Design a binder for this molecule. Sequence first.
Ligand SMILES: [Mg+2]
Ligand SMILES: [Mg+2]
Ligand SMILES: [Mg+2]
Ligand SMILES: [Mg+2]
Ligand SMILES: [Mg+2]
Ligand SMILES: [Mg+2]
Ligand SMILES: [Mg+2]
Ligand SMILES: [Mg+2]
Ligand SMILES: [Mg+2]
Ligand SMILES: [Mg+2]
Ligand SMILES: [Mg+2]
Ligand SMILES: [Mg+2]
Ligand SMILES: [Mg+2]
Ligand SMILES: [Mg+2]
Ligand SMILES: [Mg+2]
Ligand SMILES: [Mg+2]
Ligand SMILES: [Mg+2]
Ligand SMILES: [Mg+2]
Ligand SMILES: [Mg+2]
Ligand SMILES: [Mg+2]
Ligand SMILES: [Mg+2]
Ligand SMILES: [Mg+2]
Ligand SMILES: [Mg+2]
Ligand SMILES: [Mg+2]
Ligand SMILES: [Mg+2]
Ligand SMILES: [Mg+2]
Ligand SMILES: [Mg+2]
Ligand SMILES: [Mg+2]
Ligand SMILES: [Mg+2]
Ligand SMILES: [Mg+2]
Ligand SMILES: [Mg+2]
Ligand SMILES: [Mg+2]
Ligand SMILES: [Mg+2]
Ligand SMILES: [Mg+2]
Ligand SMILES: [Mg+2]
Ligand SMILES: [Mg+2]
Ligand SMILES: [Mg+2]
Ligand SMILES: [Mg+2]
Ligand SMILES: [Mg+2]
Ligand SMILES: [Mg+2]
Ligand SMILES: [Mg+2]
Ligand SMILES: [Mg+2]
Ligand SMILES: [Mg+2]
Ligand SMILES: [Mg+2]
Ligand SMILES: [Mg+2]
Ligand SMILES: [Mg+2]
Ligand SMILES: [Mg+2]
Ligand SMILES: [Mg+2]
Ligand SMILES: [Mg+2]
Ligand SMILES: [Mg+2]
Ligand SMILES: [Mg+2]
Ligand SMILES: [Mg+2]
Ligand SMILES: [Mg+2]
Ligand SMILES: [Mg+2]
Ligand SMILES: [Mg+2]
Ligand SMILES: [Zn+2]
Lengths: 174, 59, 211, 142, 38
Amino acid sequence: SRVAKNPVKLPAGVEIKLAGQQLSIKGAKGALELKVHPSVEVIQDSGELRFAARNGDQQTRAMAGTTRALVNNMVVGVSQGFERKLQLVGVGYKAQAKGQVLSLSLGFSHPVDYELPAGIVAETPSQTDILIKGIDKQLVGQVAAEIRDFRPPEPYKGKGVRYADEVVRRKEAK
Amino acid sequence: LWIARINAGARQNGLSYSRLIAGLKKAAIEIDRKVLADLAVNEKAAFTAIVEKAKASLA
Amino acid sequence: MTIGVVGRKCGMTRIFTEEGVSIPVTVIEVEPNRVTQFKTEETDGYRAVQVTAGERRASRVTKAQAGHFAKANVAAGRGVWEFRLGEEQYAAGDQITVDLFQAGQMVDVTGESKGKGFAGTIKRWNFRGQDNTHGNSVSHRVPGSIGQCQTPGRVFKGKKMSGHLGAERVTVQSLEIVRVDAERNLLLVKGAVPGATGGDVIVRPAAKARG
Amino acid sequence: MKTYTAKPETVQRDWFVVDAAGQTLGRLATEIARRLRGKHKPEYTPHVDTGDYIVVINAEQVRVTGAKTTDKMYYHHSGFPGGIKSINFEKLIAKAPERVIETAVKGMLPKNPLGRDMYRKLKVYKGASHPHTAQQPQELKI
Amino acid sequence: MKVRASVKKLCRNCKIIRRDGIVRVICSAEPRHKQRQG
RNA sequence: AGGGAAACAACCCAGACCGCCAGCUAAGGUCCCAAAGUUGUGGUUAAGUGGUAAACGAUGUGGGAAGGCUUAGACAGCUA
RNA sequence: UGUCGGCUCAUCACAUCCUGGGGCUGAAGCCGGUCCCAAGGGUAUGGCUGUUCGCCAUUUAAAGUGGUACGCGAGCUGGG
RNA sequence: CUGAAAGCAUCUAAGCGGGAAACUUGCCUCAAGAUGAGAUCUCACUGGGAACUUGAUUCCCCUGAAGGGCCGUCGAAGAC
Ligand SMILES: [Mg+2]
Ligand SMILES: [Mg+2]
Ligand SMILES: [Mg+2]
Ligand SMILES: [Mg+2]
Ligand SMILES: [Mg+2]
Ligand SMILES: [Mg+2]
Ligand SMILES: [Mg+2]
Ligand SMILES: [Mg+2]
Ligand SMILES: [Mg+2]
Ligand SMILES: [Mg+2]
Ligand SMILES: [Mg+2]
Ligand SMILES: [Mg+2]
Ligand SMILES: [Mg+2]
Ligand SMILES: [Mg+2]
Ligand SMILES: [Mg+2]
Ligand SMILES: [Mg+2]
Ligand SMILES: [Mg+2]
Ligand SMILES: [Mg+2]
Ligand SMILES: [Mg+2]
Ligand SMILES: [Mg+2]
Ligand SMILES: [Mg+2]
Ligand SMILES: [Mg+2]
Ligand SMILES: [Mg+2]
Ligand SMILES: [Mg+2]
Ligand SMILES: [Mg+2]
Ligand SMILES: [Mg+2]
Ligand SMILES: [Mg+2]
Ligand SMILES: [Mg+2]
Ligand SMILES: [Mg+2]
Ligand SMILES: [Mg+2]
Ligand SMILES: [Mg+2]
Ligand SMILES: [Mg+2]
Ligand SMILES: [Mg+2]
Ligand SMILES: [Mg+2]
Ligand SMILES: [Mg+2]
Ligand SMILES: [Mg+2]
Ligand SMILES: [Mg+2]
Ligand SMILES: [Mg+2]
Ligand SMILES: [Mg+2]
Ligand SMILES: [Mg+2]
Ligand SMILES: [Mg+2]
Ligand SMILES: [Mg+2]
Ligand SMILES: [Mg+2]
Ligand SMILES: [Mg+2]
Ligand SMILES: [Mg+2]
Ligand SMILES: [Mg+2]
Ligand SMILES: [Mg+2]
Ligand SMILES: [Mg+2]
Ligand SMILES: [Mg+2]
Ligand SMILES: [Mg+2]
Ligand SMILES: [Mg+2]
Ligand SMILES: [Mg+2]
Ligand SMILES: [Mg+2]
Ligand SMILES: [Mg+2]
Ligand SMILES: [Mg+2]
Ligand SMILES: [Zn+2]
C-alpha cells in the first residue's frame, strides 16, 4: 500500500474542484481532466491530496492504489503532458505529419494514413521519428501502440516501428 | 386443500401457517383443519379472533 | 431499391451492337403507374407508396374497391402493388414511369415463374436415377432411401421429396438495362426474366450492385 | 357441511402494477406467479382461475446476480435437423426485454389448460407506462 | 505458446500470472518460455 | 401394496380386515411447479462449485503453530 | 429382429483434410514443423479384385476421421 | 493501453481497445391458427308484432344489401 500512502504533491498552478466523488483538475495548455471514484474510496482535500478507504476488504485495498496513480497522471498531464517517441528502422520507411492526419509508408503496396483523435498532436521532427504528444497517459499510449501494430519490429533486421527505448531481440539466419 | 387455505388466511392477519399451528397447540385450541379452513372463507371475523389468540400465546 | 414500376413481360429478342456482339434482351412494357395511396409513419407504422396499373372494366371492380380508387382520382386498373420506399414524396394521383431508370443501371426483376405441375425428385431436386439395366426392378426414377433404422426412426423435416415445381415468385438480381424507350413505354433488359409472356413483373433498382 | 369451492362465475379479480427496476429476476417471478394463481386468498381452489392481474412496467431493468448476465443461455429448437438455437441474457434484453420475465414466470406455472389461462393475466412492458389506466392498477411492493 | 497441464518457471525471468482464471507464464528473456493452462 | 429416491422388482421408511371431508409421526422435506420456515444465530465459497474425475500444476482465499533477516538500515526497485 | 459389398438418399460429432485467424521455431525469402481457435461451405476419375481395404495411373485447394441395427433389401441389386 | 493488490513487474482486480468463412443482421423465399388470431383504405345494411324463465332470450310476418358461390367459355394454372 506504499503507493496509497504517498501524497500527490500538486504543482503550483493548478485547481482542484471536488463536488462529491466526482473530481477534476484544472491546468494550462490543456485542462479538464475528469473522473469519478468507486464508493469505496476516500479523498481528503488539503494543501495536498490524500487517499484512504472506507472498508477493509481486499478489493477496496487494491483500488486505493489505482486511484492514487490515476489522479497523479491527471495532475501531471495538465501541467506537463505526457509524450511518446516512435522510431522507424528500415530503408524506404518514413512518416510525415499533416494537421490531424499522419501518413506512414511502411513498405506496403499503398501508403497508409492514420487519423489522430482530438487531444493528442503528432509531429515528426525527422522523416524517421514520430513524436506523440497529449495530456493523458492512457490516450497517448493507446495511439502510440495503434501506430506500432502497423508494422511491429522483426528480429532478423529490426525493420518496423519501435519505441525509442524498447529492446528488440535479435537473431541470425541458420 | 385445507392447509393451503389456512395458510392464505393466516398471512392476511400477519402469521404463517406453521407459526399459527404452534400457537394453537400452545394455548389450548384444538379445532380441526376442516373447520379452520371453513372459517377462513366465510366467518372471517371469527378466524381473526382465533389468529390473534394464537399470536397472544407468544408463538 | 424501394421504388420501381410494374410491367408486363413481352418476350425475348436480341439487339446487335456496332461492334458485332449480340445482347440477349427481354422486353418489358411499363404502362405508366398511378399512385393510389401514400403510407406514412404517423398513419401506418411503416412508410411506402401504393400503386395501380392497367385497365379494369367497371363490372369487375367492386363497390368497396371503386371508392378506394376514387379517393385519389385514379380510375381502376388491374391489380394493386406496394413499394416500400425509404425517403420519398408522392401525392395521390401521381405518375411513375420508366423515366426513373437509365442505361447501365443494374436492376432487380421480380416475377412469378412458370409452373410445372407435380414434379419428381429428378426434375425438382436434381437427383440421379438408378440403373436402367443390370437387373433393376421398377425402380428407375424413384428416390431411394429416405432415412435410417431405429435411431431416429422417423423422416427428418425438410427432406427432399417430389411435388409441385412452383409457380412461385423469384427475383433475378443485377440485370443491366440496355435501353429505355420513354415514348413507347418500354424497358429493354439484358438477360432472362422469370415467368411467362404477359405476366406481371416488378422492376426495382439493384439490391446489391456495388461492383 | 361440504368444503367450499369457488365458482368461476363470481371470482373477484384486481389489478396490480409492479416495477421490475432493480429486482432479481427469480425472486420477482415467484411472487408474480403466486398472485396469478390465487395462493394469496382463502378462496383458492386447485381447478379454477382465481388470481389477480399483474402489470410489469420496467422490464428491461431487471437484473441477475453473479456472472449470469453473460453466461445464462436460452435454447429452443425449430424442428429441422441441427435447429438448436441459442441466445443469452445480455443479448435478449436488447432484442426482446419482455420475453425475459415472461419466460421466468411461465416455467413456474402449471403446464395444462388452466396454467395457460393464468399466464394470460400478465402484462409486461418495457417503458414506464402501460395502456391499462382504465383498470386503475394498484401499487405492489415486490 | 506451449499448452500443458504442468506449467512452471524455466529461468529467472519467467513470471507466473493468473489472467481471466488461467495460469500463465510470461518471460521477458526468451519468448520460448510462454506457457498456458496448467 | 403405501410414502421417499424425478421416472426406477431386490435401496430407505413401513407390513394394506372395511368405512370417515378427524388428529400425531417415520424416511424425506418446507422460493414456484407442489403440502409445509424467502425461520433465527456464527462462519465458508464466486467456482452456477453446489449439479460427474486421476497423477500432477498454480502469488485463488479462510484459520493455526512456529521460524529466518530488520533503524549497526531488512525485501524489491534505481546509480557505480 | 433378413447378416458382406455396390447403387440412391442422407443426418450428426470434432479428435480439422482444404479454405479462415494466431503463438513458438534449429522461422532470412519461397517452402515447412508443431501447438491453439474455428464445423460456414467444399472434400477425385479409372486399372485389378465379390470385395470394404490395398497397390498402381492421372488429377485436385483438398481428395478428413468417426457415430447413425459396422444408417439405408415393406428403396433397388445379388457378385461374396 | 492505462494499473494496483505486491515502491518493481503485470492485458485485469476497477476502467478503455483491436480481433476470424463460426454467432446476430445485411441477400432470397414463406410467414397473424403469432387463439398474443396485428394494421391501413374503402363499401353495405337505419321494419314491425307477440311470448317470457325479463336480457349476448324465444317465436311470427316483411325485407335480404355489400358480396360469395353454383353454372358456362377457358388458361404458359392444374392429379381432384
Ligand atoms: Mg403448368
Ligand atoms: Mg449415375
Ligand atoms: Mg446387377
Ligand atoms: Mg422378379
Ligand atoms: Mg424395367
Ligand atoms: Mg434430403
Ligand atoms: Mg405436457
Ligand atoms: Mg492438457
Ligand atoms: Mg480475453
Ligand atoms: Mg413406490
Ligand atoms: Mg436416480
Ligand atoms: Mg412416486
Ligand atoms: Mg404435526
Ligand atoms: Mg425429521
Ligand atoms: Mg405434474
Ligand atoms: Mg406451497
Ligand atoms: Mg433468511
Ligand atoms: Mg451448476
Ligand atoms: Mg457442475
Ligand atoms: Mg446431436
Ligand atoms: Mg478443436
Ligand atoms: Mg484442417
Ligand atoms: Mg486452419
Ligand atoms: Mg496459419
Ligand atoms: Mg503456424
Ligand atoms: Mg463437423
Ligand atoms: Mg455444418
Ligand atoms: Mg462439412
Ligand atoms: Mg454468417
Ligand atoms: Mg479405387
Ligand atoms: Mg471384377
Ligand atoms: Mg461400430
Ligand atoms: Mg458405423
Ligand atoms: Mg449395415
Ligand atoms: Mg458406416
Ligand atoms: Mg428397411
Ligand atoms: Mg433389393
Ligand atoms: Mg445389401
Ligand atoms: Mg421395413
Ligand atoms: Mg422385402
Ligand atoms: Mg418394393
Ligand atoms: Mg446370378
Ligand atoms: Mg451367387
Ligand atoms: Mg504499474
Ligand atoms: Mg503493462
Ligand atoms: Mg476488468
Ligand atoms: Mg469489434
Ligand atoms: Mg466481419
Ligand atoms: Mg470465400
Ligand atoms: Mg454452428
Ligand atoms: Mg388474422
Ligand atoms: Mg386482422
Ligand atoms: Mg350481390
Ligand atoms: Mg373472388
Ligand atoms: Mg385446367
Ligand atoms: Zn523464461
